[model samples]
Target: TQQPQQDEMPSPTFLTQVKESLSSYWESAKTAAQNLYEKTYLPAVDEKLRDLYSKSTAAMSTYTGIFTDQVLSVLKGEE
Candidate 1:
């Protein structure tokens, strides 16, 4: 799931924004996990790994959304 970068350091503000965004994303992920636990019924062979994959995918999407929005805003002079 790794993406190529432009080989430049992210601005301090950008890094700070990502940190804050990820913090909130983690909170949401916790809630997602709780919901999943409450609904999950079938016992799979590798349930733990499956759960981890699900959560990781969701978290990645959340982070990517945040990063994309912030970058677009900055480029558009909206931030």
Candidate 2:
């Protein structure tokens, strides 16, 4: 099996990468690197997270197709 390319950081654990990307204003940088983790774990971590969040506290009907969105807004909160 082929290993996924390491965007950066030490290892490629899901949350670690997420925390890495928790705050990114641009791509091709650390933010983009971390965002890669979010994109990678979209179906896995994101979906599971999404599954728990049915009622939008924001009073919205649904989520967005927009990627790289901030979830909990914490640097180490992704874990």
Candidate 3:
């Protein structure tokens, strides 16, 4: 004895809307964090390391400076 269960002009279900909102919210948060990393933390750390490099270059001999620079690059997770 099932009557008509849906509206005549039904939109998306509540479950569907909830999931869609959460998916978009998750993506937005992830992108915001990545943007902050790239725009703020990345440049700040690069500038700090560069200042250290300039001072080290003037203070150390060529051989030791090269070694130190390589070590810094390694610390920076690079080639």
lDDT of 3: 0.66
Please report the candidate that would top lDDT against the real structure: 1
Estimate, for each residue in 1-79, the C-alpha lDDT of model 3 and write its tens digit. 1223254333456434555667667766888888777877456777778898888776766758767886898987864
TM-score of each: 0.29, 0.21, 0.24
- The true-structure Cα RMSD of candidate 3 reads 21.5
Cα lDDT for residue 55, candidate 3? 85
Please give, for residues 1-79, the per-residue lDDT of candidate 2 as tens digits: 2224455334557446555453443344666687778788466666667765765534354344222244434435856
Task: Order the candidate numbers by TM-score, best to worst.
Answer: 1, 3, 2
lDDT of each: 0.70, 0.52, 0.66
Question: How much is 75 displaced in model 1, in angstroms?
Answer: 23
Model 1 scores what on Cα lDDT? Answer: 0.70
lDDT per residue, candidate 1, 1-79, as tens digits? 2223344457665565665667667867888888787657646537877888899897989879888987888987964
lDDT, model 2: 0.52
Model 2 clash tally, residue pairs:
0
| Weakest 10 consecutive residues of candidate 1 by summed lDDT | 1-10
- Error at 20, model 3, angstroms: 56
Candidate 3: worst 10 consecutive residues by lDDT?
1-10
